[PDB]
Design a protein around this ligand. Structure first.
Ligand SMILES: [Zn+2]
Ligand SMILES: [Zn+2]
Ligand SMILES: [Zn+2]
Ligand SMILES: [Zn+2]
Ligand SMILES: [Zn+2]
Lengths: 358, 358, 358, 358, 358
């Protein structure tokens, strides 16, 4: 009988960075029907399907007849995790960021292309809103990227502080999506903490989202174990040494801590190289209300919006040499749809609390 | 010796959406006797049997001789879960709803057909009672379906509030059955919470049923951790970002929260785009008492009752194009059994607290 | 079909001391392309790749076609752990230290060589700062190494005591990296303690880092279970007998305990042969501020910095005979870059709180 | 292809009493190179290597080519545990002690032989110090051995009571090493107790080391659950019946309980056939300070020191017939190095707090 | 190659009632050397060896060459447990007792035979002491056996109450050994209780040994959860219905509850068909002190002592027909060693607190 090439299944998982055994199994089985009459290839809207169907057709037919499908996929997903282990030790942090940027640019080429449904002007309206959230926003994003790539001990964490609806959660989520990584919850007791801290294994950055303090009930701020927990994770935050994570011995990822207006102990404050305070701006909330596509299409939380922001404001030299050709094609695309004049009109509209797109 | 086709067992599980290894094993073994003398095929009351017996007979005989039955079924059930993973990422939410609607219509074709035991007039009496529970009920159901399909961040949860016997539990259960999904219990301590929150993996919607508050003992309302737990799951409820679920990284499903008349903190209230208050109506309870078939046949909790409601009130254009032919056949079926005149008589009977069917 | 040599995969894991199944898998797969056109071999910056690619090429190609990759790697990683078991019982502690010294010297030959990116003068500036942290620092480091190698019962633990930014954490981390071993956290309750104490299995030394006491809130020192836990581990600290560790029956490793200025009970104090008090020195902090490369390149926490310190101050006879040839080549390398005169200038610069490198 | 003899691997584990799968794997792989050029055989310092290398060479070469090494070793280690099960039920307790005595004498032949590094006069100085710890010490050791071999119900436990540095921990550790067995910690809560009590499975004796009481803080004695726990283990201590141990249904091993000067409840006191009180003796501490080799080489905690003590004081008839030939050779060895005159000088030196060896 | 007969290994486990995989493995390997030169067969002191060596020699040699020894033994031990399942449902309780009696008589034939070391007169002295513990002791033992065999609901538990050294623990242990079964500890909290209650699966009887109450500290009686736990296990004690045990759905075994002089709640008291109060008798303690062999050889806790008691007092008709031939041979053996006259002298000696044997 015919033998399935485990190596070809592995190659597909590697090309698509597949970390889910069931997702790989499902995607591979979907290559078993003739590409000539494939409606999915014809629609050309899922690159992980249409760019691989022809190369994997004959092997996928054999795979459909296999009595050992889960094992084939488990080896393929293990090889992807093995590659991630190698890269976490050999790749420079700049190459890691280039890899994430190429991933976001692939999505961008799809959603804003001939077979996509995203509206580029809507994302650019998102860029304008984000550029109004803080002064020198392109520099704030750029200085954050440099802090994450350089990963300097004791100078690797930023504190985002402010009430709800201040944009702190949105910007931290957008930054996490731009760099790739995980959001953690440290509001649990120390007993459960180590398995949550384990979520940081081989991650480029982390966000300790919505960390809570105590005795702030008189200000209507909920109680939690977060601030105390963080105050006891100086080694995780400092990144001076490798920590023993459980779920690897590695430097805990750098990142962001977001929190409401709680009292920050002197010891925990010393852990942050920077603190950005987010305050409610009526015009930002009003403009967002008038530009519902931003909320509906989850634009403000997107790393593609921050990459678009960076491509709009920064020259080709501000990007690593390996992505120069993609930045050039994207700058040409943005010039066709918006000008510095119309971009400035969008920002004036945000400032007035008016719809961003006229 | 003869070899069992694992692929054919998988196809049967896929066609029947089988997620239970033991159920698949039992159903497949029941195909091993000759279809010509099969009493189950003759009775024609179980489509998952009678539509597959002929196609699976020879393979089922070989399967009966297999020394590896559980493994064959485990691969088949894994392929179904693999397909669900693919669909959760590639299918649009409208296609997901069409899939659930075709599932309910299959059941409807069976129970109200030549080999069924359900009484269509009884279900239509259920439609009349449900249409009396709230004003513009067909619009309330339709606006809910649009909120679940659109899945807009921060505008994805409805709050059903009221005492017991007010119809809040019944309507939330009927809506969950119409969309497909799971009911969750968050009245447990936060330590056990994450495995309950895990029940939401690849689910189209969820219901946090009968969430409890504190200090309402003076109103005879029981104490529980539910309201506090929900107030700490802003990220799960908002659906602005993907959450790390344990039992996948995904947007937590949208849905409903049902609760008795507890105090709702300002922070948790902000999480709900809509709040429907359910109050006891003597006529509704009296009419239900006089129409016992509704309780006995579990009609008021059924998604088939809400689909029948939708088919009765809404034109073919209000349904996705893919189910237009099935809606037409069902509208013709309903016209034969009830008219707008007799439907209005049923509602007047509900309003009087009289039996719905004269 | 061709058969993968499990023995050759094992040999690669043994030569590289590979303890991670996924890392081994990834590294071995990276040998599958022709060495003649290998960019990684051409770059010559990863010895675990370039020194093994030619020897493992044909086997790695066969390994890429294997349906049992994880099993091959699990046996290889088990053989490495088996070797560690044999060595923990048969190797003398001096041979164990020589093994760690040869590991650090391999890294040093790489980072300061033709294909490395480290700056030797920066590390020597680190040596000068460390030599200013305590009087007779080369003797303090040397007397520590003798205490760890001799492993004398009740005379095997040193206590590092002082406030934050006093250099106690940095020096303990640098000593742990020079000897090889693990840092432990005993601030948890006794229930979780035994699995943490298990981290010490086959380890040459341990550091109980940042151990906390109670009732020091009035001095802004956080509360924890550490000091009490240690006071109940007399058998672990004394090393008079073998302890039953869970994760082996062995003598618990010797080491260091670091802590802030808490009260030390008379019983726990008796456990330490030496106590070094670390006090803040403004000039040390100022000099470090002016010499940012030390913080950025994690030089002060490095065992390579302490080995460089030892090679600078101590003659060839102070090192075991087995590494005499490597010490000689390193003394010649250091003489080319620094003199006793310029080294003394660096220390005077530290003393002034000025940049270490002029 | 050549087949590895699993039976020969098992025989090696049986001859060496190997209970560790990884240690067996490592030791067996070390037999794969030619014995003719083996440096380890030439050094003749590890009998578990040099007495087996020639017999296992060809099989070890085949073992190096095996794809199932861990399984081969797991069966070998299971056979050793199987043998221990058989012996625990069929061997008399005298034969069990002879087995332990032959194990200690094997170590003694090695460390004090041509390829050993131990100094016999140092161990004999240890014998002199131990003989000064209590009156009639050779009789105390001999009466203990008889209590452990006879294993009489309710007359099987001795209580060692005294402050720290009184020699109670040292003597209990030395007795445990002379008989073979495990030290247990019962200071934990009853919930974790049963898995600790499980450490006693197939053990010849146990030591409940440093058991703590309550309300002794006013005497600077730490609090713990030990004394209370023991007071509830009358069945374990009495050994009248078999207990259900978890980690077997067996009589819990006899042994020793060591503790500081806590109050012992009347019920727990009744459990001990003997109580030896250890008080600080300045001369013993002073002599030990002047004879540092005892501490450095862990002589006072060694069962070889107590066996040497027994061989020095007791005639050949006091030992089981099966070890008479080994006792004779050891008495001849001791006569060459010490006389009753010089032994008495050593004891006088201990009594003066002077170095034991002049 | 030669094949090991798994069926023959199973037969050996069945003949010896082997429930331990490791013990079976060890015993089977000990059949591999020639029976002609077997010292163990020559000694004739272990029937599980000498009665099976010849029948299992050739198979044991093949077993020594097996690469799957643990699996062979696991199937054999599973077959023994399978047989126990069948017997627990099909055997009458009288047949179960006959099976236990034949097991004790096998041990008796060995220890009191030509190759045994037990002294029958010592056991008969034990019989005399036990016959002095309560009036009509042969009837008390006989009425207990009838209560356990009949297993009548609500009339299946006896309560043994008294201080320590009153003989309650000894007699309950002797009765448990005569019937076969397990001793349980219910002094733990209800959370751990169900796994302890699970120890009763397929057991003929159980003893809840040394059950504790509360608020008896003023009488120097320790506190525990036992009495409260038992008061909540009415269904387990009553045996009216099957209980769901976890570690089977079965009637919980009948048995005994032993306890010190605590207050017994009215509800728990109702659970016991009989209560025997044990009070200290100075003469019994004095006689035991003068007859140390009873304590040393664990005679008073032995089911063989109670069987000997029964054989001495009761005629052949009081025993089941299936063991009549063995009772006759044992009555002839006892008549040779003791008479009714000398037995009465032994009891008079117990009554005087004198040595039992003159
Ligand atoms: Zn396609
Ligand atoms: Zn059929
Ligand atoms: Zn290469
Ligand atoms: Zn050798
Ligand atoms: Zn034999």
């Amino acid at each position: 009988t015919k033998q399935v090439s485990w190596k070809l299944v592995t190659q597909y998982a590697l090309d698509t960075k597949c970390e889910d055994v069931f997702l790989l199994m499902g995607m591979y089985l979907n290559f078993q029907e003739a590409p000539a009459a494939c409606a999915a290839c014809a629609a050309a809207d899922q690159p992980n399907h249409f760019n691989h169907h022809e190369k994997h057709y004959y092997n996928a037919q054999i795979f459909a007849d296999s009595k050992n499908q889960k094992s084939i996929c488990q080896q393929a997903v293990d090889t992807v995790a093995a590659k991630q282990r190698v890269d976490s030790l050999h790749m420079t942090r700049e190459e890691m960021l280039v890899e994430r940027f190429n991933f976001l640019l692939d999505k961008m080429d799809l959603i804003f292309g001939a077979h996509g449904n995203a509206v580029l002007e809507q994302y650019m309206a998102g860029v304008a809103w984000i550029h109004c959230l803080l002064p020198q926003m392109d520099t704030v994003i750029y200085e954050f990227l440099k802090c994450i790539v350089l990963n300097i001990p004791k100078k690797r964490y930023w504190l985002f502080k402010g009430p709800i609806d201040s944009g702190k959660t949105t910007l931290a989520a957008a930054l996490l999506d731009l760099c790739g990584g995980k959001s953690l919850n440290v509001n649990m007791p120390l007993e459960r903490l180590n398995f949550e801290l384990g979520v940081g294994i081989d991650q480029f950055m982390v966000v300790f989202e919505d960390v809570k303090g105590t005795g702030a009930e008189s200000r209507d701020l909920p109680s939690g174990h977060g601030i105390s927990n963080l105050d006891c994770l100086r080694d995780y935050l400092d990144g001076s040494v490798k920590v023993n994570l459980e779920r690897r011995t590695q430097v805990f990822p750098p990142g962001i801590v977001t929190m409401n207006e709680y009292s920050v102990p002197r010891t925990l404050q010393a852990r942050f190289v920077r603190q950005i305070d987010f305050r409610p701006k009526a015009y930002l909330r009003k403009s967002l209300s008038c530009s519902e596509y931003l909320l509906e299409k989850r634009i403000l939380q997107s790393g593609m919006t921050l990459l678009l922001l960076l491509i709009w404001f920064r020259p080709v030299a501000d990007f690593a040499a390996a992505i120069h050709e993609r930045i050039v094609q994207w700058k040409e695309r943005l010039d066709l749809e918006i000008s510095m004049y119309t971009f400035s009109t969008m920002k004036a509209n945000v400032g007035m609390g008016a719809p961003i797109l006229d």
